[PDB]
Scaffold this active site. Structure first.
Site, PDB file in Angstrom:
ATOM      1  N   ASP A  96       0.812  -1.241   0.000  1.00 51.19           N
ATOM      2  CA  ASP A  96       0.000   0.000   0.000  1.00 51.19           C
ATOM      3  C   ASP A  96       0.823   1.258   0.000  1.00 51.19           C
ATOM      4  O   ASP A  96       0.251   2.346   0.069  1.00 51.19           O
ATOM      5  CB  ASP A  96      -1.000  -0.010   1.154  1.00 51.19           C
ATOM      6  CG  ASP A  96      -0.337  -0.121   2.494  1.00 51.19           C
ATOM      7  OD1 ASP A  96      -0.993  -0.569   3.494  1.00 51.19           O
ATOM      8  OD2 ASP A  96       0.863   0.317   2.636  1.00 51.19           O
TER       9      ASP A  96
ATOM     10  N   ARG B 141       0.862   6.754  -0.137  1.00 49.88           N
ATOM     11  CA  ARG B 141       0.226   5.709   0.634  1.00 49.88           C
ATOM     12  C   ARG B 141      -1.235   5.624   0.152  1.00 49.88           C
ATOM     13  O   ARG B 141      -1.897   6.666  -0.008  1.00 49.88           O
ATOM     14  CB  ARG B 141       0.310   6.137   2.142  1.00 49.88           C
ATOM     15  CG  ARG B 141      -0.566   5.276   3.057  1.00 49.88           C
ATOM     16  CD  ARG B 141      -0.050   3.815   3.043  1.00 49.88           C
ATOM     17  NE  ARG B 141      -0.658   3.080   4.177  1.00 49.88           N
ATOM     18  CZ  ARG B 141      -1.827   2.466   4.191  1.00 49.88           C
ATOM     19  NH1 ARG B 141      -2.664   2.594   3.161  1.00 49.88           N
ATOM     20  NH2 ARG B 141      -2.207   1.723   5.285  1.00 49.88           N
TER      21      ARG B 141
ATOM     22  N   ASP C 293      -5.678  -0.990   4.229  1.00 44.31           N
ATOM     23  CA  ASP C 293      -4.482  -1.412   4.886  1.00 44.31           C
ATOM     24  C   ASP C 293      -4.156  -2.787   4.377  1.00 44.31           C
ATOM     25  O   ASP C 293      -5.012  -3.630   4.425  1.00 44.31           O
ATOM     26  CB  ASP C 293      -4.649  -1.452   6.411  1.00 44.31           C
ATOM     27  CG  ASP C 293      -3.339  -1.661   7.110  1.00 44.31           C
ATOM     28  OD1 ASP C 293      -2.264  -1.258   6.566  1.00 44.31           O
ATOM     29  OD2 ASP C 293      -3.400  -2.134   8.255  1.00 44.31           O
ATOM     30  N   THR C 294      -3.025  -2.915   3.687  1.00 44.65           N
ATOM     31  CA  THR C 294      -2.422  -4.217   3.370  1.00 44.65           C
ATOM     32  C   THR C 294      -1.655  -4.718   4.561  1.00 44.65           C
ATOM     33  O   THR C 294      -1.188  -3.901   5.389  1.00 44.65           O
ATOM     34  CB  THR C 294      -1.556  -4.160   2.080  1.00 44.65           C
ATOM     35  OG1 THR C 294      -0.500  -3.174   2.237  1.00 44.65           O
ATOM     36  CG2 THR C 294      -2.442  -3.803   0.809  1.00 44.65           C
TER      37      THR C 294
ATOM     38  N   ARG D 293       3.747  11.350   3.517  1.00 37.91           N
ATOM     39  CA  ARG D 293       3.343  10.512   2.327  1.00 37.91           C
ATOM     40  C   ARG D 293       2.105  11.141   1.690  1.00 37.91           C
ATOM     41  O   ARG D 293       1.179  11.512   2.366  1.00 37.91           O
ATOM     42  CB  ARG D 293       3.030   9.101   2.738  1.00 37.91           C
ATOM     43  CG  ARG D 293       4.207   8.411   3.459  1.00 37.91           C
ATOM     44  CD  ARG D 293       3.872   6.986   3.832  1.00 37.91           C
ATOM     45  NE  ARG D 293       2.832   6.910   4.833  1.00 37.91           N
ATOM     46  CZ  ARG D 293       2.392   5.778   5.379  1.00 37.91           C
ATOM     47  NH1 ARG D 293       2.869   4.599   4.977  1.00 37.91           N
ATOM     48  NH2 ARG D 293       1.416   5.819   6.284  1.00 37.91           N
TER      49      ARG D 293
HETATM   50  C1  LIG Z   1      -3.860   5.509   5.031  1.00 37.86           C
HETATM   51  C2  LIG Z   1      -3.487   6.592   6.099  1.00 37.86           C
HETATM   52  C3  LIG Z   1      -2.528   6.270   7.032  1.00 37.86           C
HETATM   53  N1  LIG Z   1      -2.246   7.238   7.971  1.00 37.86           N
HETATM   54  C4  LIG Z   1      -1.320   6.937   9.016  1.00 37.86           C
HETATM   55  C5  LIG Z   1      -2.122   6.236  10.118  1.00 37.86           C
HETATM   56  C6  LIG Z   1      -1.075   5.321  10.688  1.00 37.86           C
HETATM   57  O1  LIG Z   1      -0.213   6.096  11.552  1.00 37.86           O
HETATM   58  P1  LIG Z   1       0.614   5.396  12.771  1.00 37.86           P
HETATM   59  O2  LIG Z   1       1.792   4.745  12.148  1.00 37.86           O
HETATM   60  O3  LIG Z   1       1.041   6.595  13.622  1.00 37.86           O
HETATM   61  O4  LIG Z   1      -0.338   4.439  13.382  1.00 37.86           O
HETATM   62  C7  LIG Z   1      -0.207   4.939   9.522  1.00 37.86           C
HETATM   63  C8  LIG Z   1      -0.766   3.663   8.866  1.00 37.86           C
HETATM   64  O5  LIG Z   1       0.067   3.470   7.733  1.00 37.86           O
HETATM   65  P2  LIG Z   1       0.787   2.101   7.341  1.00 37.86           P
HETATM   66  O6  LIG Z   1      -0.356   1.114   7.314  1.00 37.86           O
HETATM   67  O7  LIG Z   1       1.654   2.370   6.140  1.00 37.86           O
HETATM   68  O8  LIG Z   1       1.747   1.773   8.516  1.00 37.86           O
HETATM   69  O9  LIG Z   1      -0.326   6.029   8.588  1.00 37.86           O
HETATM   70  C9  LIG Z   1      -2.873   8.505   7.919  1.00 37.86           C
HETATM   71  O10 LIG Z   1      -2.596   9.405   8.801  1.00 37.86           O
HETATM   72  N2  LIG Z   1      -3.765   8.854   6.973  1.00 37.86           N
HETATM   73  C10 LIG Z   1      -4.133   7.889   6.058  1.00 37.86           C
HETATM   74  O11 LIG Z   1      -5.019   8.211   5.282  1.00 37.86           O
HETATM   75 CA   LIG Z   2      -0.211  -1.309   5.726  1.00 36.47          CA
END
Ligand SMILES: Cc1cn([C@H]2C[C@H](OP(=O)(O)O)[C@@H](COP(=O)(O)O)O2)c(=O)[nH]c1=O
Ligand SMILES: [Ca+2]
EC number: 3.1.31.1
Length: 132
Positions: A15, A29, A34-35, A78
Site C-alpha cells: 500500500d 500511501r 491497509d495491506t 506521504r
Molecule cells: C492511510 C493513512 C494512514 N495514515 C497513518 C495512520 C497510521 O499512523 P501510525 O503509524 O502513527 O499508526 C499509519 C498507517 O500506515 P501504514 O499502514 O503504512 O503503517 O499512517 C494517515 O494518517 N492517513 C491515512 O489516510
Molecule cells: Ca499497511
C-alpha cells in the site's frame, strides 16, 4: 476529484510506493486501505498484497493519483491518494482480492469509502485470502 499523472519509481509494499510526482520523488500511501504489514517489527497475506500491488503498478502503461477532498499528505509526509493503473483503482483491486481491508477512514478523505466497502463485502462473501 481529479486524476493527475505520476510515474512509478518503486513499489514498497502492498500500500506504499515511491512516485515521481510533479518532478519530485515522493512517497505515496493508498487511501482507505491497509495491506498486511511486512516491514515494521510479517502478517499473513503481506507478501501476497505486496506482490499484487507491485505487479499492478509495474505493468501499467499509465499511473494516476487522485487526491481526496481533505489532507493530501499524512504526518509522515506521504501523499494520500487513490492510485489508478490504466484506469483501474489499485485501492479497490487489492480490497476486491481480500488482500487489503478498508481501514484508516479519516474524514473528509472518505469519498470512495462505500465503493471500497462494497468490494470488501464481495471479497469476504467469496472467502478470499484474508477472508478465507
Ligand atoms: C492511510 C493513512 C494512514 N495514515 C497513518 C495512520 C497510521 O499512523 P501510525 O503509524 O502513527 O499508526 C499509519 C498507517 O500506515 P501504514 O499502514 O503504512 O503503517 O499512517 C494517515 O494518517 N492517513 C491515512 O489516510
Ligand atoms: Ca499497511
Amino acid at each position: 476529484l481529479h486524476k493527475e499523472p505520476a510515474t512509478l519509481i518503486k513499489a514498497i509494499d502492498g500500500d506504499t510506493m515511491k512516485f515521481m510526482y510533479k518532478g519530485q520523488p515522493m512517497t505515496f500511501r493508498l487511501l482507505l486501505v491497509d495491506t498486511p504489514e511486512t516491514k515494521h517489527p510479517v502478517e499473513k497475506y503481506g507478501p501476497e498484497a505486496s506482490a499484487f500491488f507491485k505487479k499492478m503498478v509495474e505493468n501499467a502503461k499509465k499511473i494516476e493519483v487522485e487526491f481526496d477532498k481533505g489532507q493530501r499528505t499524512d504526518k509522515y509526509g506521504r501523499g494520500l491518494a487513490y492510485i489508478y493503473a490504466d484506469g483501474k483503482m489499485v485501492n479497490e483491486a487489492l480490497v476486491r482480492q481480500g488482500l487489503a481491508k478498508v481501514a484508516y477512514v479519516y474524514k473528509p478523505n472518505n469519498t470512495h469509502e462505500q465503493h471500497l466497502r462494497k468490494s470488501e463485502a464481495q471479497a469476504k462473501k467469496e472467502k478470499l485470502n484474508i477472508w478465507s
